[PDB]
PDB file of all heavy atoms in Angstrom:
ATOM      1  N   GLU A 752    -144.602 -53.329-162.468  1.00 40.10           N
ATOM      2  CA  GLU A 752    -143.563 -53.912-161.624  1.00 40.10           C
ATOM      3  C   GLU A 752    -142.798 -55.040-162.295  1.00 40.10           C
ATOM      4  O   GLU A 752    -141.590 -55.163-162.084  1.00 40.10           O
ATOM      5  CB  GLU A 752    -144.179 -54.431-160.314  1.00 40.10           C
ATOM      6  CG  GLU A 752    -145.399 -55.321-160.502  1.00 40.10           C
ATOM      7  CD  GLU A 752    -145.839 -55.989-159.215  1.00 40.10           C
ATOM      8  OE1 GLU A 752    -145.102 -56.863-158.711  1.00 40.10           O
ATOM      9  OE2 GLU A 752    -146.920 -55.632-158.701  1.00 40.10           O
ATOM     10  N   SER A 753    -143.462 -55.866-163.099  1.00 39.98           N
ATOM     11  CA  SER A 753    -142.842 -57.034-163.707  1.00 39.98           C
ATOM     12  C   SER A 753    -142.579 -56.794-165.189  1.00 39.98           C
ATOM     13  O   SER A 753    -143.142 -55.889-165.811  1.00 39.98           O
ATOM     14  CB  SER A 753    -143.723 -58.276-163.533  1.00 39.98           C
ATOM     15  OG  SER A 753    -144.916 -58.168-164.291  1.00 39.98           O
ATOM     16  N   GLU A 754    -141.707 -57.631-165.748  1.00 39.80           N
ATOM     17  CA  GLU A 754    -141.360 -57.582-167.161  1.00 39.80           C
ATOM     18  C   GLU A 754    -142.241 -58.488-168.011  1.00 39.80           C
ATOM     19  O   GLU A 754    -141.986 -58.633-169.211  1.00 39.80           O
ATOM     20  CB  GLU A 754    -139.894 -57.975-167.354  1.00 39.80           C
ATOM     21  CG  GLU A 754    -138.912 -57.140-166.553  1.00 39.80           C
ATOM     22  CD  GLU A 754    -137.489 -57.642-166.681  1.00 39.80           C
ATOM     23  OE1 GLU A 754    -137.279 -58.667-167.362  1.00 39.80           O
ATOM     24  OE2 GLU A 754    -136.580 -57.012-166.101  1.00 39.80           O
ATOM     25  N   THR A 755    -143.265 -59.098-167.420  1.00 38.14           N
ATOM     26  CA  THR A 755    -144.087 -60.061-168.133  1.00 38.14           C
ATOM     27  C   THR A 755    -145.186 -59.358-168.922  1.00 38.14           C
ATOM     28  O   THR A 755    -145.517 -58.193-168.687  1.00 38.14           O
ATOM     29  CB  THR A 755    -144.715 -61.058-167.159  1.00 38.14           C
ATOM     30  OG1 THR A 755    -145.587 -60.368-166.255  1.00 38.14           O
ATOM     31  CG2 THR A 755    -143.640 -61.783-166.368  1.00 38.14           C
ATOM     32  N   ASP A 756    -145.751 -60.093-169.879  1.00 36.48           N
ATOM     33  CA  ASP A 756    -146.895 -59.616-170.641  1.00 36.48           C
ATOM     34  C   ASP A 756    -148.216 -59.845-169.919  1.00 36.48           C
ATOM     35  O   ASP A 756    -149.234 -59.278-170.331  1.00 36.48           O
ATOM     36  CB  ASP A 756    -146.936 -60.306-172.005  1.00 36.48           C
ATOM     37  CG  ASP A 756    -147.033 -61.814-171.890  1.00 36.48           C
ATOM     38  OD1 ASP A 756    -146.496 -62.375-170.913  1.00 36.48           O
ATOM     39  OD2 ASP A 756    -147.650 -62.439-172.776  1.00 36.48           O
ATOM     40  N   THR A 757    -148.223 -60.658-168.861  1.00 35.93           N
ATOM     41  CA  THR A 757    -149.455 -60.918-168.124  1.00 35.93           C
ATOM     42  C   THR A 757    -149.878 -59.713-167.294  1.00 35.93           C
ATOM     43  O   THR A 757    -151.074 -59.523-167.049  1.00 35.93           O
ATOM     44  CB  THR A 757    -149.275 -62.136-167.216  1.00 35.93           C
ATOM     45  OG1 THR A 757    -148.891 -63.270-168.003  1.00 35.93           O
ATOM     46  CG2 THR A 757    -150.570 -62.455-166.467  1.00 35.93           C
ATOM     47  N   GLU A 758    -148.920 -58.897-166.848  1.00 36.28           N
ATOM     48  CA  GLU A 758    -149.259 -57.761-165.999  1.00 36.28           C
ATOM     49  C   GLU A 758    -150.118 -56.745-166.741  1.00 36.28           C
ATOM     50  O   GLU A 758    -150.970 -56.092-166.127  1.00 36.28           O
ATOM     51  CB  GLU A 758    -147.988 -57.096-165.475  1.00 36.28           C
ATOM     52  CG  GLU A 758    -148.251 -56.031-164.421  1.00 36.28           C
ATOM     53  CD  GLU A 758    -146.978 -55.431-163.865  1.00 36.28           C
ATOM     54  OE1 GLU A 758    -145.883 -55.866-164.278  1.00 36.28           O
ATOM     55  OE2 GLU A 758    -147.074 -54.521-163.015  1.00 36.28           O
ATOM     56  N   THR A 759    -149.915 -56.595-168.052  1.00 37.61           N
ATOM     57  CA  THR A 759    -150.751 -55.698-168.838  1.00 37.61           C
ATOM     58  C   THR A 759    -152.200 -56.167-168.912  1.00 37.61           C
ATOM     59  O   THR A 759    -153.067 -55.379-169.301  1.00 37.61           O
ATOM     60  CB  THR A 759    -150.184 -55.547-170.252  1.00 37.61           C
ATOM     61  OG1 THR A 759    -150.115 -56.831-170.883  1.00 37.61           O
ATOM     62  CG2 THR A 759    -148.793 -54.923-170.210  1.00 37.61           C
ATOM     63  N   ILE A 760    -152.478 -57.421-168.550  1.00 34.62           N
ATOM     64  CA  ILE A 760    -153.856 -57.894-168.492  1.00 34.62           C
ATOM     65  C   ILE A 760    -154.483 -57.539-167.150  1.00 34.62           C
ATOM     66  O   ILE A 760    -155.693 -57.301-167.070  1.00 34.62           O
ATOM     67  CB  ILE A 760    -153.914 -59.409-168.754  1.00 34.62           C
ATOM     68  CG1 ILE A 760    -153.327 -59.733-170.132  1.00 34.62           C
ATOM     69  CG2 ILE A 760    -155.350 -59.915-168.651  1.00 34.62           C
ATOM     70  CD1 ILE A 760    -153.144 -61.211-170.391  1.00 34.62           C
ATOM     71  N   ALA A 761    -153.683 -57.496-166.083  1.00 34.83           N
ATOM     72  CA  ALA A 761    -154.205 -57.138-164.770  1.00 34.83           C
ATOM     73  C   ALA A 761    -154.406 -55.633-164.648  1.00 34.83           C
ATOM     74  O   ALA A 761    -155.450 -55.173-164.172  1.00 34.83           O
ATOM     75  CB  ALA A 761    -153.264 -57.641-163.674  1.00 34.83           C
ATOM     76  N   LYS A 762    -153.414 -54.847-165.072  1.00 36.45           N
ATOM     77  CA  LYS A 762    -153.536 -53.396-165.017  1.00 36.45           C
ATOM     78  C   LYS A 762    -154.636 -52.874-165.932  1.00 36.45           C
ATOM     79  O   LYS A 762    -155.057 -51.722-165.781  1.00 36.45           O
ATOM     80  CB  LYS A 762    -152.205 -52.745-165.396  1.00 36.45           C
ATOM     81  CG  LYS A 762    -151.059 -53.065-164.454  1.00 36.45           C
ATOM     82  CD  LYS A 762    -151.259 -52.433-163.087  1.00 36.45           C
ATOM     83  CE  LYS A 762    -150.064 -52.686-162.183  1.00 36.45           C
ATOM     84  NZ  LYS A 762    -149.807 -54.138-161.979  1.00 36.45           N
ATOM     85  N   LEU A 763    -155.109 -53.688-166.876  1.00 35.29           N
ATOM     86  CA  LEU A 763    -156.134 -53.273-167.827  1.00 35.29           C
ATOM     87  C   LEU A 763    -157.544 -53.646-167.385  1.00 35.29           C
ATOM     88  O   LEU A 763    -158.474 -52.859-167.586  1.00 35.29           O
ATOM     89  CB  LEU A 763    -155.856 -53.885-169.205  1.00 35.29           C
ATOM     90  CG  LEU A 763    -156.748 -53.404-170.355  1.00 35.29           C
ATOM     91  CD1 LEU A 763    -156.621 -51.901-170.567  1.00 35.29           C
ATOM     92  CD2 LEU A 763    -156.402 -54.145-171.635  1.00 35.29           C
ATOM     93  N   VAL A 764    -157.735 -54.830-166.796  1.00 33.23           N
ATOM     94  CA  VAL A 764    -159.050 -55.182-166.267  1.00 33.23           C
ATOM     95  C   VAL A 764    -159.450 -54.212-165.165  1.00 33.23           C
ATOM     96  O   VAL A 764    -160.642 -53.994-164.920  1.00 33.23           O
ATOM     97  CB  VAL A 764    -159.061 -56.642-165.771  1.00 33.23           C
ATOM     98  CG1 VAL A 764    -158.145 -56.817-164.565  1.00 33.23           C
ATOM     99  CG2 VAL A 764    -160.479 -57.084-165.443  1.00 33.23           C
ATOM    100  N   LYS A 765    -158.466 -53.620-164.483  1.00 35.69           N
ATOM    101  CA  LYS A 765    -158.753 -52.575-163.509  1.00 35.69           C
ATOM    102  C   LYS A 765    -159.057 -51.246-164.188  1.00 35.69           C
ATOM    103  O   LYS A 765    -159.848 -50.454-163.664  1.00 35.69           O
ATOM    104  CB  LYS A 765    -157.574 -52.416-162.548  1.00 35.69           C
ATOM    105  CG  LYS A 765    -157.848 -51.491-161.373  1.00 35.69           C
ATOM    106  CD  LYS A 765    -156.595 -51.260-160.546  1.00 35.69           C
ATOM    107  CE  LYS A 765    -156.890 -50.423-159.313  1.00 35.69           C
ATOM    108  NZ  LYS A 765    -157.516 -49.114-159.653  1.00 35.69           N
ATOM    109  N   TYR A 766    -158.440 -50.983-165.344  1.00 37.03           N
ATOM    110  CA  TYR A 766    -158.735 -49.759-166.081  1.00 37.03           C
ATOM    111  C   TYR A 766    -160.170 -49.762-166.595  1.00 37.03           C
ATOM    112  O   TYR A 766    -160.864 -48.742-166.518  1.00 37.03           O
ATOM    113  CB  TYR A 766    -157.748 -49.594-167.236  1.00 37.03           C
ATOM    114  CG  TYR A 766    -157.961 -48.342-168.056  1.00 37.03           C
ATOM    115  CD1 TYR A 766    -157.514 -47.108-167.605  1.00 37.03           C
ATOM    116  CD2 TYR A 766    -158.601 -48.396-169.287  1.00 37.03           C
ATOM    117  CE1 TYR A 766    -157.705 -45.962-168.351  1.00 37.03           C
ATOM    118  CE2 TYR A 766    -158.796 -47.254-170.043  1.00 37.03           C
ATOM    119  CZ  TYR A 766    -158.345 -46.040-169.570  1.00 37.03           C
ATOM    120  OH  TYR A 766    -158.536 -44.901-170.317  1.00 37.03           O
ATOM    121  N   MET A 767    -160.631 -50.899-167.123  1.00 36.56           N
ATOM    122  CA  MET A 767    -162.031 -51.026-167.508  1.00 36.56           C
ATOM    123  C   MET A 767    -162.957 -50.959-166.302  1.00 36.56           C
ATOM    124  O   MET A 767    -164.141 -50.640-166.459  1.00 36.56           O
ATOM    125  CB  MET A 767    -162.253 -52.340-168.260  1.00 36.56           C
ATOM    126  CG  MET A 767    -161.400 -52.494-169.512  1.00 36.56           C
ATOM    127  SD  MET A 767    -161.736 -51.231-170.756  1.00 36.56           S
ATOM    128  CE  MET A 767    -160.575 -51.695-172.038  1.00 36.56           C
ATOM    129  N   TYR A 768    -162.445 -51.254-165.106  1.00 37.13           N
ATOM    130  CA  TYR A 768    -163.239 -51.139-163.889  1.00 37.13           C
ATOM    131  C   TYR A 768    -163.277 -49.708-163.367  1.00 37.13           C
ATOM    132  O   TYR A 768    -164.272 -49.303-162.755  1.00 37.13           O
ATOM    133  CB  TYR A 768    -162.679 -52.077-162.816  1.00 37.13           C
ATOM    134  CG  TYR A 768    -163.303 -51.905-161.447  1.00 37.13           C
ATOM    135  CD1 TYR A 768    -164.466 -52.580-161.102  1.00 37.13           C
ATOM    136  CD2 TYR A 768    -162.722 -51.074-160.498  1.00 37.13           C
ATOM    137  CE1 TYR A 768    -165.037 -52.427-159.851  1.00 37.13           C
ATOM    138  CE2 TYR A 768    -163.285 -50.914-159.247  1.00 37.13           C
ATOM    139  CZ  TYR A 768    -164.441 -51.593-158.928  1.00 37.13           C
ATOM    140  OH  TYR A 768    -165.004 -51.436-157.682  1.00 37.13           O
ATOM    141  N   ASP A 769    -162.218 -48.934-163.602  1.00 38.06           N
ATOM    142  CA  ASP A 769    -162.154 -47.548-163.153  1.00 38.06           C
ATOM    143  C   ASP A 769    -162.840 -46.581-164.110  1.00 38.06           C
ATOM    144  O   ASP A 769    -162.779 -45.368-163.884  1.00 38.06           O
ATOM    145  CB  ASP A 769    -160.693 -47.125-162.965  1.00 38.06           C
ATOM    146  CG  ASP A 769    -159.990 -47.917-161.879  1.00 38.06           C
ATOM    147  OD1 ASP A 769    -160.655 -48.735-161.211  1.00 38.06           O
ATOM    148  OD2 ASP A 769    -158.769 -47.722-161.696  1.00 38.06           O
ATOM    149  N   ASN A 770    -163.487 -47.080-165.168  1.00 36.21           N
ATOM    150  CA  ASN A 770    -164.156 -46.219-166.136  1.00 36.21           C
ATOM    151  C   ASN A 770    -165.450 -46.851-166.640  1.00 36.21           C
ATOM    152  O   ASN A 770    -165.854 -46.616-167.784  1.00 36.21           O
ATOM    153  CB  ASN A 770    -163.235 -45.903-167.316  1.00 36.21           C
ATOM    154  CG  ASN A 770    -162.010 -45.112-166.903  1.00 36.21           C
ATOM    155  OD1 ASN A 770    -160.878 -45.565-167.066  1.00 36.21           O
ATOM    156  ND2 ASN A 770    -162.233 -43.918-166.365  1.00 36.21           N
ATOM    157  N   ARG A 771    -166.107 -47.652-165.804  1.00 36.60           N
ATOM    158  CA  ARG A 771    -167.368 -48.266-166.185  1.00 36.60           C
ATOM    159  C   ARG A 771    -168.480 -47.216-166.215  1.00 36.60           C
ATOM    160  O   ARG A 771    -168.294 -46.057-165.832  1.00 36.60           O
ATOM    161  CB  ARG A 771    -167.722 -49.400-165.223  1.00 36.60           C
ATOM    162  CG  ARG A 771    -167.880 -48.972-163.768  1.00 36.60           C
ATOM    163  CD  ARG A 771    -168.121 -50.171-162.861  1.00 36.60           C
ATOM    164  NE  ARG A 771    -168.512 -49.777-161.508  1.00 36.60           N
ATOM    165  CZ  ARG A 771    -167.666 -49.553-160.506  1.00 36.60           C
ATOM    166  NH1 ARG A 771    -166.357 -49.678-160.683  1.00 36.60           N
ATOM    167  NH2 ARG A 771    -168.133 -49.198-159.316  1.00 36.60           N
ATOM    168  N   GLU A 772    -169.656 -47.638-166.682  1.00 34.58           N
ATOM    169  CA  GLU A 772    -170.802 -46.746-166.822  1.00 34.58           C
ATOM    170  C   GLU A 772    -171.803 -46.879-165.681  1.00 34.58           C
ATOM    171  O   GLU A 772    -172.382 -45.876-165.254  1.00 34.58           O
ATOM    172  CB  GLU A 772    -171.517 -46.991-168.158  1.00 34.58           C
ATOM    173  CG  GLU A 772    -172.298 -48.306-168.270  1.00 34.58           C
ATOM    174  CD  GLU A 772    -171.403 -49.525-168.394  1.00 34.58           C
ATOM    175  OE1 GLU A 772    -170.165 -49.358-168.415  1.00 34.58           O
ATOM    176  OE2 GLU A 772    -171.938 -50.650-168.473  1.00 34.58           O
ATOM    177  N   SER A 773    -172.020 -48.091-165.179  1.00 35.50           N
ATOM    178  CA  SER A 773    -172.947 -48.337-164.086  1.00 35.50           C
ATOM    179  C   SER A 773    -172.183 -48.846-162.871  1.00 35.50           C
ATOM    180  O   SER A 773    -171.080 -49.386-162.984  1.00 35.50           O
ATOM    181  CB  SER A 773    -174.030 -49.348-164.489  1.00 35.50           C
ATOM    182  OG  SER A 773    -173.455 -50.576-164.901  1.00 35.50           O
ATOM    183  N   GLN A 774    -172.789 -48.664-161.696  1.00 34.67           N
ATOM    184  CA  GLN A 774    -172.132 -49.044-160.451  1.00 34.67           C
ATOM    185  C   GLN A 774    -171.976 -50.554-160.313  1.00 34.67           C
ATOM    186  O   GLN A 774    -171.179 -51.005-159.483  1.00 34.67           O
ATOM    187  CB  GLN A 774    -172.914 -48.492-159.258  1.00 34.67           C
ATOM    188  CG  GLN A 774    -172.234 -48.694-157.908  1.00 34.67           C
ATOM    189  CD  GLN A 774    -170.886 -48.003-157.819  1.00 34.67           C
ATOM    190  OE1 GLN A 774    -170.568 -47.130-158.628  1.00 34.67           O
ATOM    191  NE2 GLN A 774    -170.085 -48.392-156.836  1.00 34.67           N
ATOM    192  N   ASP A 775    -172.710 -51.348-161.109  1.00 31.92           N
ATOM    193  CA  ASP A 775    -172.670 -52.805-161.015  1.00 31.92           C
ATOM    194  C   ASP A 775    -172.611 -53.403-162.426  1.00 31.92           C
ATOM    195  O   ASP A 775    -173.564 -54.000-162.926  1.00 31.92           O
ATOM    196  CB  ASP A 775    -173.872 -53.343-160.233  1.00 31.92           C
ATOM    197  CG  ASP A 775    -175.196 -52.851-160.784  1.00 31.92           C
ATOM    198  OD1 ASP A 775    -175.183 -52.077-161.764  1.00 31.92           O
ATOM    199  OD2 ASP A 775    -176.249 -53.238-160.236  1.00 31.92           O
ATOM    200  N   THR A 776    -171.464 -53.244-163.082  1.00 30.80           N
ATOM    201  CA  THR A 776    -171.202 -53.907-164.352  1.00 30.80           C
ATOM    202  C   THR A 776    -170.624 -55.290-164.078  1.00 30.80           C
ATOM    203  O   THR A 776    -169.655 -55.424-163.324  1.00 30.80           O
ATOM    204  CB  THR A 776    -170.237 -53.090-165.215  1.00 30.80           C
ATOM    205  OG1 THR A 776    -169.027 -52.843-164.487  1.00 30.80           O
ATOM    206  CG2 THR A 776    -170.867 -51.765-165.618  1.00 30.80           C
ATOM    207  N   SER A 777    -171.225 -56.311-164.684  1.00 32.02           N
ATOM    208  CA  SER A 777    -170.827 -57.686-164.415  1.00 32.02           C
ATOM    209  C   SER A 777    -169.334 -57.876-164.656  1.00 32.02           C
ATOM    210  O   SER A 777    -168.719 -57.189-165.476  1.00 32.02           O
ATOM    211  CB  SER A 777    -171.622 -58.651-165.293  1.00 32.02           C
ATOM    212  OG  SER A 777    -171.371 -58.415-166.667  1.00 32.02           O
ATOM    213  N   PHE A 778    -168.749 -58.823-163.918  1.00 34.52           N
ATOM    214  CA  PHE A 778    -167.342 -59.154-164.120  1.00 34.52           C
ATOM    215  C   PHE A 778    -167.078 -59.567-165.561  1.00 34.52           C
ATOM    216  O   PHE A 778    -165.989 -59.320-166.091  1.00 34.52           O
ATOM    217  CB  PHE A 778    -166.930 -60.274-163.158  1.00 34.52           C
ATOM    218  CG  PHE A 778    -165.462 -60.280-162.800  1.00 34.52           C
ATOM    219  CD1 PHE A 778    -165.016 -61.010-161.709  1.00 34.52           C
ATOM    220  CD2 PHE A 778    -164.530 -59.571-163.544  1.00 34.52           C
ATOM    221  CE1 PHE A 778    -163.678 -61.029-161.365  1.00 34.52           C
ATOM    222  CE2 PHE A 778    -163.191 -59.587-163.204  1.00 34.52           C
ATOM    223  CZ  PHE A 778    -162.765 -60.317-162.114  1.00 34.52           C
ATOM    224  N   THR A 779    -168.064 -60.193-166.212  1.00 34.49           N
ATOM    225  CA  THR A 779    -167.909 -60.561-167.614  1.00 34.49           C
ATOM    226  C   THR A 779    -167.680 -59.330-168.481  1.00 34.49           C
ATOM    227  O   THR A 779    -166.805 -59.330-169.354  1.00 34.49           O
ATOM    228  CB  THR A 779    -169.143 -61.328-168.093  1.00 34.49           C
ATOM    229  OG1 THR A 779    -169.346 -62.481-167.264  1.00 34.49           O
ATOM    230  CG2 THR A 779    -168.976 -61.776-169.541  1.00 34.49           C
ATOM    231  N   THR A 780    -168.458 -58.268-168.255  1.00 31.68           N
ATOM    232  CA  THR A 780    -168.306 -57.055-169.050  1.00 31.68           C
ATOM    233  C   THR A 780    -166.885 -56.512-168.959  1.00 31.68           C
ATOM    234  O   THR A 780    -166.299 -56.115-169.973  1.00 31.68           O
ATOM    235  CB  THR A 780    -169.312 -55.996-168.593  1.00 31.68           C
ATOM    236  OG1 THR A 780    -170.637 -56.542-168.634  1.00 31.68           O
ATOM    237  CG2 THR A 780    -169.251 -54.769-169.495  1.00 31.68           C
ATOM    238  N   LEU A 781    -166.317 -56.485-167.753  1.00 27.96           N
ATOM    239  CA  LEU A 781    -164.944 -56.015-167.593  1.00 27.96           C
ATOM    240  C   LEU A 781    -163.977 -56.879-168.393  1.00 27.96           C
ATOM    241  O   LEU A 781    -163.163 -56.366-169.169  1.00 27.96           O
ATOM    242  CB  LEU A 781    -164.564 -56.007-166.110  1.00 27.96           C
ATOM    243  CG  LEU A 781    -165.416 -55.116-165.202  1.00 27.96           C
ATOM    244  CD1 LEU A 781    -165.014 -55.307-163.749  1.00 27.96           C
ATOM    245  CD2 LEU A 781    -165.294 -53.652-165.602  1.00 27.96           C
ATOM    246  N   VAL A 782    -164.057 -58.200-168.221  1.00 30.33           N
ATOM    247  CA  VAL A 782    -163.166 -59.103-168.944  1.00 30.33           C
ATOM    248  C   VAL A 782    -163.381 -58.974-170.446  1.00 30.33           C
ATOM    249  O   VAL A 782    -162.429 -59.043-171.233  1.00 30.33           O
ATOM    250  CB  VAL A 782    -163.371 -60.551-168.461  1.00 30.33           C
ATOM    251  CG1 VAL A 782    -162.543 -61.528-169.292  1.00 30.33           C
ATOM    252  CG2 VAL A 782    -163.010 -60.670-166.986  1.00 30.33           C
ATOM    253  N   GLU A 783    -164.634 -58.789-170.871  1.00 30.99           N
ATOM    254  CA  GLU A 783    -164.918 -58.667-172.299  1.00 30.99           C
ATOM    255  C   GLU A 783    -164.229 -57.446-172.896  1.00 30.99           C
ATOM    256  O   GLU A 783    -163.732 -57.496-174.027  1.00 30.99           O
ATOM    257  CB  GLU A 783    -166.427 -58.599-172.530  1.00 30.99           C
ATOM    258  CG  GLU A 783    -167.135 -59.941-172.397  1.00 30.99           C
ATOM    259  CD  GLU A 783    -168.634 -59.838-172.618  1.00 30.99           C
ATOM    260  OE1 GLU A 783    -169.129 -58.715-172.847  1.00 30.99           O
ATOM    261  OE2 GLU A 783    -169.317 -60.883-172.562  1.00 30.99           O
ATOM    262  N   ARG A 784    -164.186 -56.338-172.151  1.00 30.08           N
ATOM    263  CA  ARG A 784    -163.498 -55.148-172.641  1.00 30.08           C
ATOM    264  C   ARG A 784    -161.989 -55.350-172.682  1.00 30.08           C
ATOM    265  O   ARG A 784    -161.299 -54.693-173.472  1.00 30.08           O
ATOM    266  CB  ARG A 784    -163.844 -53.944-171.765  1.00 30.08           C
ATOM    267  CG  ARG A 784    -165.321 -53.589-171.755  1.00 30.08           C
ATOM    268  CD  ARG A 784    -165.634 -52.564-170.678  1.00 30.08           C
ATOM    269  NE  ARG A 784    -167.070 -52.348-170.527  1.00 30.08           N
ATOM    270  CZ  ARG A 784    -167.621 -51.606-169.571  1.00 30.08           C
ATOM    271  NH1 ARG A 784    -166.858 -51.002-168.669  1.00 30.08           N
ATOM    272  NH2 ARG A 784    -168.938 -51.469-169.512  1.00 30.08           N
ATOM    273  N   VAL A 785    -161.460 -56.245-171.847  1.00 29.89           N
ATOM    274  CA  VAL A 785    -160.021 -56.496-171.827  1.00 29.89           C
ATOM    275  C   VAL A 785    -159.608 -57.291-173.061  1.00 29.89           C
ATOM    276  O   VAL A 785    -158.733 -56.871-173.827  1.00 29.89           O
ATOM    277  CB  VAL A 785    -159.621 -57.223-170.531  1.00 29.89           C
ATOM    278  CG1 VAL A 785    -158.149 -57.634-170.562  1.00 29.89           C
ATOM    279  CG2 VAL A 785    -159.893 -56.339-169.329  1.00 29.89           C
TER     280      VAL A 785
END
């Protein structure tokens, strides 16, 4: 939606969340993959 570079960080932390391995991967793991 936006022209900023920050949006690619939000759409990506969700991508790492939509393809995790376990049902309860820590929030750190998601951010670490980003």
Side-chain angles (χ1 to χ4, degrees):
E752 50 171 292
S753 68
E754 304 175 358
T755 63
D756 59 328
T757 303
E758 188 177 358
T759 59
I760 301 171
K762 297 292 184 301
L763 187 60
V764 66
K765 188 186 184 304
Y766 181 79
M767 302 298 179
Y768 172 87
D769 297 355
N770 296 119
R771 60 185 190 270
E772 71 287 359
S773 58
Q774 187 61 16
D775 54 359
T776 56
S777 62
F778 207 164
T779 303
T780 305
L781 300 175
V782 175
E783 284 179 359
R784 299 169 188 173
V785 174

